[PDB]
Amino acid sequence: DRLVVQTSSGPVRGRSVTVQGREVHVYTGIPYAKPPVEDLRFRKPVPAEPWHGVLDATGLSATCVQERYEYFPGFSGEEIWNPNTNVSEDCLYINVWAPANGLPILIWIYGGGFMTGSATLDIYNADIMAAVGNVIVASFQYRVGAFGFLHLAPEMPSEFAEEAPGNVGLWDQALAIRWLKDNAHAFGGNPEWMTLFGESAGSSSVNAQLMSPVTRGLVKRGMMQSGTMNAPWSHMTSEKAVEIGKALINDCNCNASMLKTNPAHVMSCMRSVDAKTISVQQWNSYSGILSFPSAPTIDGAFLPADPMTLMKTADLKDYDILMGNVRDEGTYFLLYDFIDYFDKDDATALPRDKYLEIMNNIFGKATQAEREAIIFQYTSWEGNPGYQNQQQIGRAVGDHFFTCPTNEYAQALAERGASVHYYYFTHRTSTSLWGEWMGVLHGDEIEYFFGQPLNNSLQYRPVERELGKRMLSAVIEFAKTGNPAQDGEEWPNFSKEDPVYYIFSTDDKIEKLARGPLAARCSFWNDYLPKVRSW
Amino acid sequence: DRLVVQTSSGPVRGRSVTVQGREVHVYTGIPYAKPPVEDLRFRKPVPAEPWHGVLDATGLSATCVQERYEYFPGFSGEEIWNPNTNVSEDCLYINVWAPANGLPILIWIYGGGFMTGSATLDIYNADIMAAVGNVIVASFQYRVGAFGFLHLAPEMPSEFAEEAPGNVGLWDQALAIRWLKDNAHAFGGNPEWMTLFGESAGSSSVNAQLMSPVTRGLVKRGMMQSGTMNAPWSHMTSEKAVEIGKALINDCNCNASMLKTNPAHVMSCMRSVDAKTISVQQWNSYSGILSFPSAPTIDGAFLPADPMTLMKTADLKDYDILMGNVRDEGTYFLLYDFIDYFDKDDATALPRDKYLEIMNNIFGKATQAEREAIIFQYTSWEGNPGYQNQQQIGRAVGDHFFTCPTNEYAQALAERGASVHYYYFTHRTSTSLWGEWMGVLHGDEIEYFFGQPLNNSLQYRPVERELGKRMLSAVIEFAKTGNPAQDGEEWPNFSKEDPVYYIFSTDDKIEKLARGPLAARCSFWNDYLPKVRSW
Ligand SMILES: *[C@@H]1O[C@H](CO)[C@@H](OC2O[C@H](CO)[C@@H](O[C@H]3O[C@H](CO)[C@@H](O)[C@H](O[C@H]4O[C@H](CO)[C@@H](O)[C@H](O[C@H]5O[C@H](CO)[C@@H](O)[C@H](O)[C@@H]5O)[C@@H]4O)[C@@H]3O)[C@H](O)[C@H]2NC(C)=O)[C@H](O)[C@H]1NC(C)=O
Ligand SMILES: [Cl-]
Ligand SMILES: [Cl-]
């Protein structure tokens, strides 16, 4: 069977697909760890015991346990982020796309705030990327939610360290990535030619996999799409995670208080709560939009320090980073945690009642000083009263939570020596089923970097297919060379001294290279606001 | 002699001028007080003793004592603000323009920061205004500098109150204005139809004459051009003025310390210092650009409270105010107190070295909190690095010192009931001999409101003559009706609720009525910065 690869853990059988002239053998569902169930819930992953028969790697994996958004029933645009397959803890599986010293390897880490996401959503279909880019794309489920990130070792004696260390979702990724290096050659790939790439929490996970002392050196080439660990939603102190963790582990009626005189009876209890109940109970430590109960946790291990402290010493000499943002980052989340105020589909005339309403809630955790500074920075006199006030909050959240943290991380990375290219995705895809006011939603760049516009069975305007064509190629070229730039197309490095970024759109009369606008927007958050925080 | 008017103090003979079809009898040099010399230096004005023969009112008055700027030798544009006539304390004279129940009376108060200025500069020639507007224009010298504003009564016993009360320059104006009401009919005018109008400190002086309990009711119709008493350069506490005054009165080697055991030997000393030496010594208490040693002083008399406290109770029911600003207010003064950094004529690429340089000096008297807030509010990323940084300081000073104080005063006035119309002068006159980067200098609106474009012996573009035509007419129509608006031309009142302003320019494709831009610029100074001043 030419559709069989013998992996380090056994032969596997995949499917053949012919995309765009190339044949691709797509193997989905390869286990890379023991199903982290029963005893192994909350623990680091153990590698999968090898199998003998040819494993059926044609079915899609099961999706890691998570709840699913349905603030818009039926509305496809929401369910495309919801698990398309059965949800079970049995979810630690790999997917590998291999075309028919080895091809380059792109490993996809999905996003979803360490709380959601699956490698199997069709948005993540790597068929076109593998065929067109002639590269090996892999992906994999990692444990998300409390299943991946519950952290309680500080509250337990030393012997119980491996009971709930935290970050096992990242360890999962580490393991999956380690699995892929081992089996690179067996699928036709160069194990040293590996490239991580991901979006949001996936983008952040790429980040962690690149920086972590646990994994460092495994791969020094990463693409991060709107997700950096310095962002507030993408890192979390140990002591916070223990508070969240202690809440959940009696939110689940498991005591949580004897965690240190007789702990893992608390665990044994948490080992026998149904997953669905944790999958819903975890969210009650969520409020403060975009501060989820699970995050890369400073743990003395995978994340030994705060990300920016880690950056101070890291020397990223040989690292290639391709990172960026989409124009209207924060607008997907504004619609979600303030659906009370905003419409799915049409714009909102937001008043000033409702503007301070919303701004003051989002930022209550900050000084009145910087609260007022933010409110004034995102006041819009010249805009159509209302529409421009709604639109200015979507900027505020887009800026504070995504663009400006990754702008900051991008500058820190280049300072440490990494070769950083920055992109800004500003095209609204013609089939955006979201409200036009939300413009370029967070995640809208995914399908473009995967080359989905090239899918002639998907109605995209012609020059949108040329934007996919280009965006997909920048990812391939990056993976191949560390440099997303094309021939005769300039796209120089992004440094603090020259924070130039490429702009992907399909207006062919904008300046492709730009520096000013992003730097201005992020000067507020990254330079000025820190000064306001002086009491 | 048909060119003779018998005034309350004597017959006077003027000249006939035929301007634009009308004959105007222009009487310059009528005394309205005793020359405030010798004993009367620093004191309130006494009315002029009457004369018998027909007084020669054809010569121009002598200009009140003041020094003169010559940071640009020969360069006419500077000397046009310098005294065109002999400078002497003998300077308290009136000028009256009368065309051949009485015509309306416009009284012109010149500006110059209570430190400079003369009613006789040709810029202030009211020939065209009188003829075209068929109105009586009057003007008059008031004592400026230490001669008009030295304030020492608090430091003296009660008996010495009238020795140096402060504000005698304003009392001068009060007297001159009182003189003009008395002799209104004798020149062909309606004494009740009076209108004050002035520019900068003149604008502020109009303000004071309208609000002062001393003069209030005398005239309730005023035009204020870029000068309101709430502005920092236009009011000053008593205790500050005493410090300044005590400095000058031994800056002039007159002891200053025995001011309260045996004072007016200090005065007698100051009564015998040559005027020129005070005229130069007064300036050594000047530094901090646009905070002059003389200002309307809170004195318990002419200015009984801070201007904004006075506003809280004033009820301006029957007051008509026509006020406004020019586009680049602060740029004349930026060139002056920072000539080290900026060229007379061409723009300056200002660095960021030099940007914080300049901003930090201007505003040292403010918290680091608001210092930084200002620096960030006037940072320009998208502008041509340099030019836009120079240009952004000229805005900062234009805004803080003129536009936004008068914007604030304008709102306070309307709240108290005054009928306020607001204008914004944005045309750069084609013969601006200043650097193009300074755009619309402070004072550039004067010659336009006086109708000087109508002077066919002065080369102005055709539509600039239509801007003078219009600006002059708005002043006449205001004086006649309290409303600068024309027929079929909308120009509604300016209130805090609808801070709409008319825009004078000669691009006929701008929106004449506008609200947003000024309100945005002044929101910083008038709303946000006060909040930053909370420690
Ligand atoms: C371009 O755009 C197209 C339009 O959106 C898009 O379309 C479609 O292709 C997908 C996959 O090729 C179709 O998806 C399901 O429907 C198929 C038939 O309609 C199903 O057979 C299949 O289901 C099941 O197949 C999975 C394949 O990975 C697998 O998880 C399971 O089973 C399989 O394999 C074993 C052994 O080979 C068999 O025994 C099973 O029968 C099964 O085949 C699972 O049970 C597809 O998941 C979809 O319907 C197509 N149409 C539409 C409208 O979506 C393209 O994918 C886009 N991409 C490219 C590159 O063209
Ligand atoms: Cl080919
Ligand atoms: Cl006529």
Residue numbers in the entry:
A (entry chain A), B (entry chain A): 3 to 102, 139 to 573
Copy the relevant paper text:
Acetylcholinesterase (AChE) terminates synaptic transmissions at cholinergic synapses by rapid hydrolysis of the neurotransmitter, acetylcholine. The first X-ray structure of an insect AChE was published almost 20 years ago, and was that of the fruit fly Drosophila melanogaster. Thus, we here present optimized structures of DmAChE in its native form and in complexes with ZA and ZAI.
Two datasets collected from a single crystal of native DmAChE (100 images at high resolution and 100 images at low resolution) were processed and merged using XDS. The resolution of the data improved from 2.7 to 2.45 Å, and the number of unique reflections increased by 33% without dramatic loss of completeness (98.8% to 95.3%) or I/σ ratio (5.8 to 3.3) in the highest-resolution shell. However, as calculated by Phenix, the R-free is slightly smaller than the R-work in the original structure of the native enzyme, which is abnormal and suggests a bias. It is noteworthy that the original statistics reported by Harel et al., R-work = 0.258 and R-free = 0.301, are in better agreement with the statistics of the updated native DmAChE structure. The resolution improved from 2.7 to 2.5 Å, the number of unique reflections increased by 25% without any loss of completeness (98.7% to 98.4%), and with an acceptable loss in I/σ ratio in the highest-resolution shell (5.8 to 3.3). These statistics indicate a clear improvement of the overall data quality for both crystals, with more information available for the refinement of the models.
